[PDB]
Amino acid sequence: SGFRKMAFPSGKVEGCMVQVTCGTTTLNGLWLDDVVYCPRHVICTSEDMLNPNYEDLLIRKSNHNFLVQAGNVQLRVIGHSMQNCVLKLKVDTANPKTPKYKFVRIQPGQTFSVLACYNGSPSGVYQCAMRPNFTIKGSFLNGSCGSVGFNIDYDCVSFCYMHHMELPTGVHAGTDLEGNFYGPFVDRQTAQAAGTDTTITVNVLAWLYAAVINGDRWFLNRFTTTLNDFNLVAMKYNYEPLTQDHVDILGPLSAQTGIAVLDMCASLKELLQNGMNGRTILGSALLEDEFTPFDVVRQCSGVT
Amino acid sequence: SGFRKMAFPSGKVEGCMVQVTCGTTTLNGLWLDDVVYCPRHVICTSEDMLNPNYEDLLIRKSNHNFLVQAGNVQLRVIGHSMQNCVLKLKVDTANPKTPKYKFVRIQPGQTFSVLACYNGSPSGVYQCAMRPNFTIKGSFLNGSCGSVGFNIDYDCVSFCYMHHMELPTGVHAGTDLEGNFYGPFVDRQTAQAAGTDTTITVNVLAWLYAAVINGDRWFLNRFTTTLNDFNLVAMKYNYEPLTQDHVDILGPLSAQTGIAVLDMCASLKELLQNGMNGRTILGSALLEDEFTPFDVVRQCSGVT
Numbered sequence A, B: 001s002g003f004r005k006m007a008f009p010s011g012k013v014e015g016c017m018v019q020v021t022c023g024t025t026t027l028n029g030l031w032l033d034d035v036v037y038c039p040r041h042v043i044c045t046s047e048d049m050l051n052p053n054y055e056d057l058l059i060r061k062s063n064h065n066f067l068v069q070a071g072n073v074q075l076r077v078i079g080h081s082m083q084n085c086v087l088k089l090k091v092d093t094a095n096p097k098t099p100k101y102k103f104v105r106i107q108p109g110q111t112f113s114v115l116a117c118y119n120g121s122p123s124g125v126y127q128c129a130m131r132p133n134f135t136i137k138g139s140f141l142n143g144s145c146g147s148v149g150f151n152i153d154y155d156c157v158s159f160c161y162m163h164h165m166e167l168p169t170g171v172h173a174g175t176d177l178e179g180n181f182y183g184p185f186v187d188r189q190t191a192q193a194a195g196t197d198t199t200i201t202v203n204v205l206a207w208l209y210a211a212v213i214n215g216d217r218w219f220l221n222r223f224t225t226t227l228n229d230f231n232l233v234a235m236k237y238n239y240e241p242l243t244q245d246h247v248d249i250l251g252p253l254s255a256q257t258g259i260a261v262l263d264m265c266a267s268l269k270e271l272l273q274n275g276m277n278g279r280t281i282l283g284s285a286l287l288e289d290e291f292t293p294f295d296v297v298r299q300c301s302g303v304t
């Protein structure tokens, strides 16, 4: 028992982290097979922050201008190319520590672990969620760019995120491993609107089921609701509207606890309308939305 | 910017995890050099839960009765011994993935990462704190025993905790790597009092400084306090009394932000007496005490 914001064991990703340097700029790179993936802004200068012409900047760079170091061993760069907002540096050596891996583009509401890195070295790991507005609330300082988000299915690492930017609002933005930004964000030092952030309703409900499993049941009530009535409340409180797909994914948790999804929705409704009244749920005084239904089942069954 | 409950990259510990089986019972073991460390209750049966005589039980066991598997490779056991509540199985092969390591006994209030394991395999990593009452609020199911807590200073892993037990109250208890339990806990299926848990005051203050650095400054006020006045409030709210040693450790954070420790204590005083009034600090609606002053500086400076 006990519920925690648990991240994946980061070992498989640690063995992929390298340091990429181009000119005076240094960030992190991801070494899988004979390719090193990193944010394309590694080629920018102090002036090219406002409106960089990446195609024009990259033309001034040769394979020998990109310095890739894995710990203390230098990788020989034999090719370079730009794919959307990421650079792909072909190196002459396949990473011996390359795990089974996939490049996947997660949906808003899905969660992933981030292995924060500086100068190609791991500093820490934490669990994050891709917000509905496609930002992430991470912990990233200058030099952390290139750090990746991932998920693990037994032996396969699905890399979903690469860190690129911190918005003036203090939230984080980045790309999938094909260099496509999540959201409308651009890799330039310009003010960018991260739209209205909504609460991931299916995740809050999954976390309420995790709480019931662990003994925290004070919030359960004698009421039920409908999907239409619930969404009237979700709307008012900037929660994502619950769909039948969400209900279906919560099925295993409803089956495990014997509490119908619409009954759990009614508990969430009263929690939204009345608050916690100074109480806690799983050691939290707010409604947590960073555990997917999949995360709850994984943690409550011990999936390794 | 951004603050997260960040755990250490678990890679170095992953390479040490093995599965230990004795009879029908299976738990996790820790392989460093030619020794495998695991909880001594691996030798217990379904009846020997209430009052096991570990010395008598261990006498019935030979080296060949302890099965140690690292992934899928079987380790040959050449020695076995009991040190307090841990078993030390001498194996004929030194772990090739043994990192630089130390066995350290942490103080209450200190934090560490836990790499949760099942059948010798890593499931996830999370940051924890040793509560003042020597329990930990972890996430552990049956089979997780043997999972370890640790800290990392560049290349050296300091193993501080080994998971052994879950109290009837749902909190967790375990030992240091010499098999000495933290707290008064015994490795038997008996109701055990985990004393009154107090809030780690120096950690809440360190986290208030982390919040100020990241923009969350609403709680700062025009007041100051004294150590004696503050402790009158800490007492009432079951907070650890602040000492001059605590003030001294918060010095770097006070210096960084220019907010005196007693001024920050006065903010904490008003937060304790008035609550958050429905606001949040670093995305939390309660006062967080699982970040030491050391953790805050590490995260706010990017120590790898």
Ligand SMILES: Cn1ccc(CN(C(=O)Cc2cccnc2)c2ccc(-c3ccccn3)cc2)n1
Residues within 6 Å of the ligand: A025, A041, A043, A044, A045, A046, A048, A049, A050, A052, A140, A141, A142, A143, A144, A145, A164, A165, A166, A167, A186, A187, A188, A189, B001
């Ligand atoms: C062009 N561009 C793309 C994104 C950005 C904005 N940007 C960031 O937000 C990085 C960041 C900071 C803290 C936490 N997370 C991320 C950032 C990137 C790089 C440089 C930099 C510095 C010297 C030379 C060249 N490039 C400075 C600023 N600018």
Ligand SMILES: Cn1ccc(CN(C(=O)Cc2cccnc2)c2ccc(-c3ccccn3)cc2)n1
Residues within 6 Å of the ligand: A001, B025, B041, B043, B044, B045, B046, B048, B049, B050, B052, B140, B141, B142, B143, B144, B145, B164, B165, B166, B167, B186, B187, B188, B189
């Ligand atoms: C003797 N003893 C020491 C500690 C305990 C209590 N105990 C736990 O609390 C384990 C636990 C559970 C869930 C999360 N964290 C930890 C636990 C240990 C082992 C066995 C077990 C089962 C079959 C055969 C032999 N031994 C059952 C229960 N009992």
